[PDB]
Each structure stands twice: as C-alpha cells, then as structure tokens.
Design a protein around this ligand. Sequence first.
Ligand code: ATP
Ligand code: ATP
Ligand code: MG
Ligand code: MG
Ligand code: ZN
Ligand code: ZN
Lengths: 260, 260, 155, 155
Amino acid sequence: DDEWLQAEIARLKGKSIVPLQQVKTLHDWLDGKRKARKSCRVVGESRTGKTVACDAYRYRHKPQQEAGRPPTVPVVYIRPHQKCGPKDLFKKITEYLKYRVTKGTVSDFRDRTIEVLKGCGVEMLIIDEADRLKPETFADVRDIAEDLGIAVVLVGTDRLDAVIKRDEQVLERFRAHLRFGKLSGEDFKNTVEMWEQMVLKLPVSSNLKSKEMLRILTSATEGYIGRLDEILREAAIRSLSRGLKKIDKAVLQEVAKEYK
Amino acid sequence: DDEWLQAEIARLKGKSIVPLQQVKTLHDWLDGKRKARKSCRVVGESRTGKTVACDAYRYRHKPQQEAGRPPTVPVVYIRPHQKCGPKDLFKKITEYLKYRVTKGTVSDFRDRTIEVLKGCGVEMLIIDEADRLKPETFADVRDIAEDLGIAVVLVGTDRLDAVIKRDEQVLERFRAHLRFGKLSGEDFKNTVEMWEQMVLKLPVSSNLKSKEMLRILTSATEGYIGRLDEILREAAIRSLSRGLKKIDKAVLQEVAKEYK
Amino acid sequence: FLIKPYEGESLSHFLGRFRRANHLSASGLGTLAGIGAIVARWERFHFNPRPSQQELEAIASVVEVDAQRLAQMLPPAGVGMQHEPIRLCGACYAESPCHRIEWQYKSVWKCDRHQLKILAKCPNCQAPFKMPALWEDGCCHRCRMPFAEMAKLQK
Amino acid sequence: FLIKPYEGESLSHFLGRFRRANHLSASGLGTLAGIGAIVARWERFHFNPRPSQQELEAIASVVEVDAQRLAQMLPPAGVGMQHEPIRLCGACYAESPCHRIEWQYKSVWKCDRHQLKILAKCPNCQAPFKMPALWEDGCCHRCRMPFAEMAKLQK
Ligand SMILES: Nc1ncnc2c1ncn2[C@@H]1O[C@H](COP(=O)(O)OP(=O)(O)OP(=O)(O)O)[C@@H](O)[C@H]1O
Ligand SMILES: Nc1ncnc2c1ncn2[C@@H]1O[C@H](COP(=O)(O)OP(=O)(O)OP(=O)(O)O)[C@@H](O)[C@H]1O
Ligand SMILES: [Mg+2]
Ligand SMILES: [Mg+2]
Ligand SMILES: [Zn+2]
Ligand SMILES: [Zn+2]
C-alpha cells in the first residue's frame, strides 16, 4: 500500500492535460490561422491555461519524418527567456528543429535559422511569453513572417499587448487575437466535475462536487484553471498523506485559507 | 471538387498585386526621381501598401542582360534587417546584383559593392524599412548617393522620419517625400469592388459591395489596404471552408469582431 | 548534411562547402574530426607537414568521403602548387561551381577545356579571390560580379 | 600579496591566480609591470612574438618570481603548444589546483602520472574550459562540476 501511496503522490505531483472547450476553441482558431498563414496574437490572463493549450496544439501535429529528408515540423512552439536577444531567439528556433548551432555572428545564426526554417516546411511560429523578447527582435520576427510566410502567434499575458502597443508595425501586423475566458458559470462546474473524474483519479466516493464544494472552489480559484489544479492537487495530496481515502471539507477549508 | 477547393484555398492564401492609383502615383514619382537621379524618401503609415508598390516598380524594370556583359539593373530594391550594419548592407547590395561576397574587411565589401554598383549601371537604390539600419550606415548611403549618382529612396514607417531627423545631413539631402494616403472615400469603394472582381476570383453572385458591406468594411479596415486584404481573404477562406459558395454577412461580422 | 565532391574540387573549397552546409567554423570541423587547427591550415593551402594518413582518415570519418578521394582534392605527388594567388576559370565555374585544385598548380596558366587564361583576380574590379573555403557565393566579394560572368572577360 | 607557483603551473594560470590574489585586471597587472597589453596576450597563450627577456623580467619584478622560473611556466624551446583547446587532468587538479603547461603540449594526450586521457572539455556538460587565467574556482563554469570530480569521468 505504501508503494501505491508513492505512486499516487507521484501521479498527483505530475500535471495532465484535460481537453476542454477553451483549448478546443484555441486550436480551432490556430488551425484556421494556420491554413491561411495568418499571423495573430492569442492573449489572456495569467495562470489561466494558454501555455498548456498551445502545447497541446504543438503535440497534436507531431512531426512525421521521411526516411532520409529533414522531419517536417508544421508547428513551432517557443518560449524565449527574459530579455531574449535576436541571437538567442534564432538559437532557440534552430534548436527546436534539432539543428545544433555553430559559433558565429548574428548574421550567421539568422542565415542558418532561415535555411532550416524553409527546409522543414514550418507552418506555425508559436512564441509563448512573447512579452519577454527585446523590441530589436520584433523586427526579426516581422521579417520572418513577411518573407518566409509563417503565421506567428505571439502568446503572453496582457503586458504583451502593452509591449507591442508602443511599437508601430508589430501592433498592426499582429492584430487578430483570442482572449482567454474566465470560465465562470455552469461550464466551470462541468470543469470541476470533469477534473474530479479524470485528474484526481480517486475511487468513486460520490463527492459529486456538491454546492458547498462549488462555493468553496469558486471563492478559492476565482475562475483560474491553474488555481483549480493547484488547490485540487494540494487537497488530494493532503488527504492521502493523513490517511483519508477521499477529500474532506477541512482540507478544502485549509487550502482555501492558506491561499487567501 | 476537393482538388478545386485546395486550389482555391492555396490561391486565396497567396497575395497578389492589384494596380491602383496609389501605386500609380508612386511609380510615376519614382520614374520622375529616377530620370533626374534625385534621392527622395517615400513615407507612409504601417500596413498601407508601400512595400508592394516599391516591389512593383522593381519588377516592371526587369533587368535585361546582354549576351556577355553584366546584367544592367536599373532599380535596386533592398529591405535591410534590424540593426543592419554597413557590412550587412553592402553584402545585400552586391547579393541582389548576383555577385556573391568574398570574406574580407568592411573596406573590401565597400570596394566590391562600389565596383559592382558602377558595373551594372544602377539608377535606383530603394531601401525599404529604412528605419532599421544603423546611423553609421547613413554616411555610407550618403556617400553612395553623392559619388555614384544613384537616387536613393528611403522607405519606411513614420518612425523613419524621426530616425533621420536626429541626424543632420541625411535629413537635408533626403527631403522630397510622398506620403501614402488613407484611401478613404469613393475611391475606397472602387478599391473594394475591384478587389472583389480580381483578387477574390469567385463566381459572380451579385454581392456588388452593398451599403451594409461597405459600412462593415469601413468599420473594419479603417482605410488600410493590408487590413482589407486580410479581412477579404479570411472571409473568403471561411466561407469556402464551411461550404458556402459566396461570402455571407455572418463571416464579415465574425472577422470584424475578431479584429476589433 | 553530407555533400558529394565535385570532380577536381580542391580540398579548401570542399572543406568550406561542407562547413557551410553544417554551419561549422573551421575550428568546429576540426573538433568534430579530432584534429583541431589542421582544418584551417588546409583551408589556406598550408601543408608544410603534408596531410597525414591519420589526418585524412579523421576528416574522412566526418565528411564520409574516403581519404583516397580527399587526396584527389590535392595535387598528385610531385606536382607543385601555390597557396597564392587563388585562381579561377569562370567558364568552368559556370559548369560546376567549385574551385579546382589544378588552378593552384604552378605549371597551369590556361584552362585546357576552355582554352582561356585562368584568372588571378576579379577581371572587373581586380579584387583577389579569397581562399576557396570562403567562396560562399559564386561572386566577387567586392564588386559582386558572378564568377560565371567573369568567363566573358577571360582572354 | 605574493604567491608561490605550483610545480608545472602554466603562465596563464599563474598570472590569473596572482591577479585574483591582488584584485587586478590584466590591464592593471600590465601597468604595474610597465608592459601593458602583453599580460593579456600571454594569458590567452598568444606568443607569436615570444616573451622577451625584458618582458619576463618586468613581470618577475612585480610577482617576485624569477624570469627563469617564469620560463618554466611555458614549454621548453622546441616544444610546440596549442592555445586551444584548453585541457585538464582532473586527477592532477585534485592533487594541486592548477592548469599545467604540459596539457597544452601538442604531443600530450595522456597524463603520465595518472595514465588517463586528459580532458578537452567538461565531461559532464561538454562546456570547453576557459583560458587558465580565468579558472577562478575549481569548477566547470557551466554545470559547476568540480575539476577534481571530473577525474572520475576520465577514461
Ligand atoms: N487544458 C488543460 N488541461 C489541464 N490543465 C490545464 C489546462 N490548461 C491549463 N491547465 C493548468 O493551468 C496551469 C498553468 O497553465 P498555463 O501554463 O497554460 O498558463 P498560461 O495561461 O499560459 O499563463 P501564464 O502566462 O501565467 O503562465 C497548470 O496548473 C495546468 O495544469
Ligand atoms: N498594389 C497592391 N495590390 C495588392 N495588394 C496590395 C497592394 N499594396 C499593398 N497591398 C497589400 O498590403 C499588404 C502589405 O502592404 P505593404 O507590405 O506594401 O505595406 P507597407 O505600406 O510597406 O507597410 P509596412 O511598413 O507596415 O510593412 C498586403 O496584404 C498586400 O497584399
Ligand atoms: Mg503561460
Ligand atoms: Mg512595409
Ligand atoms: Zn575552364
Ligand atoms: Zn593527472
């Protein structure tokens, strides 16, 4: 049973991807923008679930490689680090395509990245956390989208909109957006129940997400998917650590007051 | 029909060049400046259509090459990348003329570029996105226009005017300008109808760009040619994806609200 | 990315072309092959210590071209060559875009195939040609005249 | 603050170690010795112009190590060395925390004392070693593995 407990805590520590309507709308919109090479910018709140949805859109088109030609990668997903320069961004582009870089100038990196970007037939350039990179690199991404005809999606918090607003071309070129919703409503309750069935993966104790539990989780998460995930995982792990088979009211109260 | 649908979506993804009065004024002005080797600077808004018009002025004078002498290129079009240094710019000049570079110092690149620039008898130096290159390169372009007698057109957004204003010589030498218009008016309606006939290339369903459609497109594009192109292409592709033979009102409403 | 040699291609030209296909510096290719600075020496046609069997086999392992074929990118035994000037037949380059090792033979002044004097500098602007490993495009690095077009100015 | 050289220590390693003990930049040590930029050249193992008697005696005056002993931080006459790659025996470093000039000898690939191949980059993360003057701590600058622990990964 101790081995089972370790397996349970390890599984609860690891996060999963429950496909819900938010990510469904997102990759539908992404496919629409991809079929037309339309460069947009998906925006949303923090801790709301944009990175996971972009990740899912990345894995669904797992590149299928030919026997002797470069693997064709339709969707490129990048999350450049803080104050990412042009050399760093190009390094990341050519590294995701599995082309190790060669020491050289910024022009050399640009040329190699362009070569490998046309070579693999890339369709999408998903730049998550697009509020980190310097504005001397937005010209480079503009040139990529202009000449190579690759639909670029700039992903980030609402601060990304402020970052691009002070610029001139990047704001006009990247204007289509898809704001991530708050999810509050009956769909939120559906989310809680679906999470209970799938992610918790606990024996059926008929918790059913009663009205009191819904009120506690509404007061706790404030609509955030990430907060919901964190609270659910913390409550499950705390119940399993103290021997409780299911999740009681005291643990939700404890985790809710610990958050707020 | 599926093959026809793929052909239609591929054609709609690809952009075209409808010749309208804006580009007509532009290449008339460009020919006037070329016949006198007068270095000017065409300026305008973003996503308004200056790059395409300069491109058209580039292709119209397709270089005619002699049997055994270098091809004579009358118009040179360049779009230097972000923070383009002098070596990078010279590389681009000699690369467009189809003279591959040889490793060396900046002086070597300058000498080779000057040699190939007088060799091909170039008349125009069209520097699009002329707000990207460093100000240590404006001295080089000044020297080119001074000694080689080549009319240089600095193309870029209104930020290019601010970039050149802080400098002394480049502002005085490059003072003639041609601001790109907003196009709003009855000429805008003519643009919509002409686009419908040519670029959409759809069967005649008598859409005729009715008053409601004109109001929606005026509210959407705000006068931009690029926004008009994007909205029209997105609406056409969305109608063709859902089986609709022509473009309905719902798709324009969807794309308009998705933009604003 | 592997490349097939062109017939007659010089070792310097081939090494640089392999490096460009793989975004490698000369030092990077040297480390991949385990021989370091030797690569850059060969690229500048400096073989005071002639290429050894072990060095040729080390490069052969990376580029997947046998040492015997690599030796045909150098003059045969007893054939003197020059590291300078780097020379060119533009008519040859138009047919096959490489520098030929024969153009560095001390005894060679005319292309036999084209019956033209070979060039020791750009005939348009007089810029000398770089070492063949650095022939990134087929054009004069100064004036940008294509090597293939220089055929028209050969005598 | 004066430092006694370690046996076999390279000139680059010794210069940097002296500078760290005295919070000196390479230019600062050069000005103290009256020879300026020469210090940084030696730290990167650049001696196309070999160290002169006057230059060695100028450094000797500051560090209080005789020019003859400083010359033993360089290869003997006729022994070729390489500025790159910088190499390391981790088992040696565990015994005496310095870079040895012998590790830059072109003929050296194995440590005689430890009968191990010497390292040309970190065996944990593959980061090349910096010039020995910059070996501030005894660890890989990237992954932070101690040089002494790299002995366990030597072959
Ligand atoms: N479809 C999903 N399935 C499961 N969990 C999800 C999903 N979408 C989001 N999450 C959860 O959201 C949290 C993090 O979301 P994500 O990293 O995508 O945020 P984001 O919206 O990109 O925001 P930020 O910019 O603040 O990082 C995690 O707890 C993750 O489990
Ligand atoms: N004459 C034209 N015919 C067809 N489409 C045009 C024409 N002029 C502009 N466009 C459209 O304008 C959009 C981009 O225009 P262009 O690249 O020329 O902009 P620009 O004015 O140079 O601005 P920016 O500096 O912001 O890139 C495209 O959608 C293109 O189809
Ligand atoms: Mg995120
Ligand atoms: Mg433009
Ligand atoms: Zn020939
Ligand atoms: Zn040892």
